[PDB]
Design an enzyme around this catalytic site. Sequence first.
Site, PDB file in Angstrom:
ATOM      1  N   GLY A 114       0.808  -1.187   0.000  1.00 27.57           N
ATOM      2  CA  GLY A 114       0.000   0.000   0.000  1.00 27.57           C
ATOM      3  C   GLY A 114       0.852   1.252   0.000  1.00 27.57           C
ATOM      4  N   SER A 196       4.455  -5.830  -2.577  1.00 28.72           N
ATOM      5  CA  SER A 196       4.719  -4.401  -2.744  1.00 28.72           C
ATOM      6  C   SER A 196       5.462  -3.830  -1.525  1.00 28.72           C
ATOM      7  CB  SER A 196       3.400  -3.652  -3.004  1.00 28.72           C
ATOM      8  OG  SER A 196       3.550  -2.510  -3.837  1.00 28.72           O
ATOM      9  N   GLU A 323       4.114  -4.948 -14.164  1.00 30.06           N
ATOM     10  CA  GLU A 323       4.114  -4.207 -12.905  1.00 30.06           C
ATOM     11  C   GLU A 323       3.788  -2.729 -13.094  1.00 30.06           C
ATOM     12  OE1 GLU A 323       4.494  -5.436  -9.956  1.00 30.06           O
ATOM     13  OE2 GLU A 323       5.684  -7.304 -10.131  1.00 30.06           O
ATOM     14  N   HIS A 436       0.321  -5.118 -11.368  1.00 32.17           N
ATOM     15  CA  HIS A 436       0.859  -5.098 -10.016  1.00 32.17           C
ATOM     16  C   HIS A 436      -0.220  -5.473  -9.003  1.00 32.17           C
ATOM     17  CE1 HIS A 436       3.620  -3.825  -6.843  1.00 32.17           C
ATOM     18  NE2 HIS A 436       2.642  -3.116  -6.308  1.00 32.17           N
TER      19      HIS A 436
HETATM   20  O1  LIG Z   1      -0.402   1.790  -3.499  1.00 31.58           O
HETATM   21  C1  LIG Z   1      -0.282   3.033  -3.689  1.00 31.58           C
HETATM   22  N1  LIG Z   1      -1.178   3.789  -2.992  1.00 31.58           N
HETATM   23  C2  LIG Z   1      -2.189   3.277  -2.102  1.00 31.58           C
HETATM   24  C3  LIG Z   1      -3.664   3.567  -2.726  1.00 31.58           C
HETATM   25  O2  LIG Z   1      -3.796   4.999  -2.992  1.00 31.58           O
HETATM   26  C4  LIG Z   1      -3.862   2.824  -4.155  1.00 31.58           C
HETATM   27  N2  LIG Z   1      -2.864   1.657  -4.298  1.00 31.58           N
HETATM   28  C5  LIG Z   1      -3.467   0.314  -3.963  1.00 31.58           C
HETATM   29  C6  LIG Z   1      -2.426  -0.861  -3.839  1.00 31.58           C
HETATM   30  C7  LIG Z   1      -2.668  -1.750  -2.585  1.00 31.58           C
HETATM   31  C8  LIG Z   1      -1.670  -2.949  -2.420  1.00 31.58           C
HETATM   32  C9  LIG Z   1      -0.927  -3.335  -3.717  1.00 31.58           C
HETATM   33  C10 LIG Z   1      -1.789  -3.164  -4.976  1.00 31.58           C
HETATM   34  C11 LIG Z   1      -2.418  -1.741  -5.127  1.00 31.58           C
HETATM   35  C12 LIG Z   1       0.761   3.477  -4.675  1.00 31.58           C
HETATM   36  C13 LIG Z   1       2.138   2.779  -4.601  1.00 31.58           C
HETATM   37  C14 LIG Z   1       3.294   3.485  -4.261  1.00 31.58           C
HETATM   38  C15 LIG Z   1       4.568   2.871  -4.189  1.00 31.58           C
HETATM   39  C16 LIG Z   1       4.730   1.516  -4.460  1.00 31.58           C
HETATM   40  C17 LIG Z   1       3.582   0.762  -4.801  1.00 31.58           C
HETATM   41  C18 LIG Z   1       2.318   1.387  -4.873  1.00 31.58           C
HETATM   42  C19 LIG Z   1       0.104   3.428  -6.033  1.00 31.58           C
HETATM   43  C20 LIG Z   1       0.017   4.556  -6.835  1.00 31.58           C
HETATM   44  C21 LIG Z   1      -0.604   4.502  -8.101  1.00 31.58           C
HETATM   45  C22 LIG Z   1      -1.163   3.313  -8.586  1.00 31.58           C
HETATM   46  C23 LIG Z   1      -1.095   2.161  -7.789  1.00 31.58           C
HETATM   47  C24 LIG Z   1      -0.470   2.232  -6.527  1.00 31.58           C
END
Ligand SMILES: O=C(NC[C@@H](O)CNCC1CCCCC1)C(c1ccccc1)c1ccccc1
EC number: 3.1.1.8
Length: 527
Positions: A114, A196, A323, A436
């Site tokens: 997250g 992640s 990813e 991802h």
């Molecule tokens: O997980 C982010 N933020 C939290 C939130 O707002 C949206 N994410 C959801 C994720 C939850 C667990 C794994 C799958 C999706 C963000 C990120 C930053 C750094 C490394 C990985 C992920 C992100 C930003 C844009 C698109 C997807 C994820």
Amino acid sequence: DIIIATKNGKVRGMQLTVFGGTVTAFLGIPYAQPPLGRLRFKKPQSLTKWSDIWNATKYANSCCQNIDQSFPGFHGSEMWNPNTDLSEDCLYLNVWIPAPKPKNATVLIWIYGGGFQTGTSSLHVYDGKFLARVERVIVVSMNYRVGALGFLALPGNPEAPGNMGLFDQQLALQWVQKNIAAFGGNPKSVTLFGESAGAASVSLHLLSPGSHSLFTRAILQSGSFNAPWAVTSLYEARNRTLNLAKLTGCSRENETEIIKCLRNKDPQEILLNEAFVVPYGTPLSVNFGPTVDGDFLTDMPDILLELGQFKKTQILVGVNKDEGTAFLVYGAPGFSKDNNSIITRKEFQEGLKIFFPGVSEFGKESILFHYTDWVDDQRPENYREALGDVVGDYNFICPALEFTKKFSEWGNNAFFYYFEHRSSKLPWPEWMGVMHGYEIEFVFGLPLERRDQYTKAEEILSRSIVKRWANFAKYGNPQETQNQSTSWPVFKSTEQKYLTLNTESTRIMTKLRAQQCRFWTSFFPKV
Ligand SMILES: O=C(NC[C@@H](O)CNCC1CCCCC1)C(c1ccccc1)c1ccccc1
Ligand SMILES: *[C@@H]1O[C@H](CO[C@@H]2O[C@@H](C)[C@@H](O)[C@@H](O)[C@@H]2O)[C@@H](O[C@@H]2O[C@H](CO)[C@@H](O)[C@H](O)[C@H]2NC(C)=O)[C@H](O)[C@H]1NC(C)=O
Ligand SMILES: *[C@@H]1O[C@H](CO[C@@H]2O[C@@H](C)[C@@H](O)[C@@H](O)[C@@H]2O)[C@@H](O[C@@H]2O[C@H](CO)[C@@H](O)[C@H](O)[C@H]2NC(C)=O)[C@H](O)[C@H]1NC(C)=O
Ligand SMILES: *[C@@H]1O[C@H](CO[C@@H]2O[C@@H](C)[C@@H](O)[C@@H](O)[C@@H]2O)[C@@H](O)[C@H](O)[C@H]1NC(C)=O
Ligand SMILES: *[C@@H]1O[C@H](CO)[C@@H](O)[C@H](O)[C@H]1NC(C)=O
Ligand SMILES: *[C@@H]1O[C@H](CO)[C@@H](O)[C@H](O)[C@H]1NC(C)=O
Ligand SMILES: *[C@@H]1O[C@H](CO)[C@@H](O)[C@H](O)[C@H]1NC(C)=O
Ligand SMILES: [Cl-]
Ligand SMILES: [Cl-]
Ligand SMILES: [Cl-]
Ligand SMILES: [Cl-]
Ligand SMILES: [Cl-]
Ligand SMILES: [Cl-]
């Protein structure tokens, strides 16, 4: 009526019917004093005994966090948002034990991702009940503080030393070591796994000396500390911390008087200002992340990795085919989940400024130079797929591969996978591929439920993955010995063999993203 005596009090669980069988779930057991009041931003404090019977029969509160509202009503984004109340009082964990109660069961401890800003253990795709029923492991997941509440950093100063959320994780590992024996689990057989930022967390517990004795092995899914988003520098953390003080009118001179000011603020005031502490941000923006505090991390981790300062044990590491796609619809021009996002050379260059803001004009050019040498110049998807590969290779695949090389150079067995199956129930569009985070359901055995609209071949793949994962946890060897499976070889720094996971085949291949990772790992850090 199954009541277990833990070292802090009795807890009551509930009984679950799974696959014509039975699993005992304990949901929302506390493992620390709630970090409220004078405890906000501090390391977690050990619980005092309770005399009642704790009713651990529903998921506890999630920790405070900013919800993703970019696609309201869209399952693909909202399946990740918390599905219990947000509360600062959130340090709780869950346990799934097989029925009948096992004797010396290998324990699996899950840590969620997250971006270190969001996440919760209660998510539907983190339900451990399947792994307990099928493989007779004990599954444990914990909630840990995220965002500034779990990573605000003023190094040295115990009122906000940093890495509180990691110390949350580390307290829970402790809870398992003192208590899981009472549940049927083997404290000597604990396997950390995460995805992640969860996976980055797992890599950091491999480096933190205070975690070396709390687990046996570790599985890293699309994530490692050496990834560019995983560690906040000491510079960034101070500017970010100081900025958050300005945004709250908490700017003071005595460093401690700043914290005290942020502790009378309500959680939403702090959540709202987290966005703007970075001037220019990327979509993958971890505003408040792991830092080199001097307690959990004693040095910068890239050095420790390079010089062999980590727990010697087996690791299981892997990544997904696409990813990078997830991030392109969170800011990249010309993209959206509602069309095939054919972009142009101009939209491609534009997108590099989005994902590489503080990078020189020559740096961006070099990224374009190495990814836009196409076979067929007429292909219209060319620039669309290139920006996905850029993001995915830079942010996940090459750091994961580099972690696995480096870790293995000190003699431990490593195994690398490459997940390349797109879920049939995947809600995002098809041009985004094997996204991802969309191996998690396969790892947790959700396709094993026939009543769930998963194809047949998806059941079989999850069954083999759940075998290999469990055999890695119990035995340090992620094979499937019975049904004539492809043998998964060890990752060695010379040959660099890895295993592909898809429904059609299961192949042994060598040197994933070779050309791509010499760029990101040997050329690009110079810029
Ligand atoms: O997980 C982010 N933020 C939290 C939130 O707002 C949206 N994410 C959801 C994720 C939850 C667990 C794994 C799958 C999706 C963000 C990120 C930053 C750094 C490394 C990985 C992920 C992100 C930003 C844009 C698109 C997807 C994820
Ligand atoms: C360190 O932080 C300062 C402050 O940045 C701002 O803080 C808040 C006011 C917030 O709401 C945002 O606007 C900013 O993040 C940075 O100084 C700013 O720099 C940008 C360009 O980099 C400039 O346009 C702003 O006017 C500046 N504002 C102030 C008050 O100085 C500074 O760049 C940061 N240092 C870094 C990123 O290295
Ligand atoms: C693909 O869609 C993007 C996103 O635009 C939004 O989503 C569309 C499905 C539709 O609802 C639009 O009205 C939305 O604005 C398109 O990018 C936009 O393109 C228009 C016209 O070229 C431009 O005025 C906007 O500034 C663009 N906005 C963004 C955020 O990029 C894109 O053109 C579409 N491409 C294809 C091939 O369908
Ligand atoms: C915990 O719950 C007790 C009652 O549990 C009830 O009976 C069991 C067999 C289950 O069917 C359960 O779903 C029922 O709710 C209460 O008597 C007790 O007070 C509760 N404890 C606390 C601290 O609330
Ligand atoms: C469980 O396994 C350990 C070794 O892994 C062993 O020493 C112990 O005696 C076993 N039994 C119990 C009840 O812990
Ligand atoms: C800041 O205030 C606290 C509490 O009054 C005090 O203990 C600390 O020494 C102060 N530091 C400075 C530099 O004045
Ligand atoms: C192997 O095949 C049998 C069916 O004959 C099945 O019951 C079993 O779960 C399979 N194991 C794995 C790991 O797929
Ligand atoms: Cl789902
Ligand atoms: Cl590929
Ligand atoms: Cl062109
Ligand atoms: Cl899904
Ligand atoms: Cl390749
Ligand atoms: Cl090169």
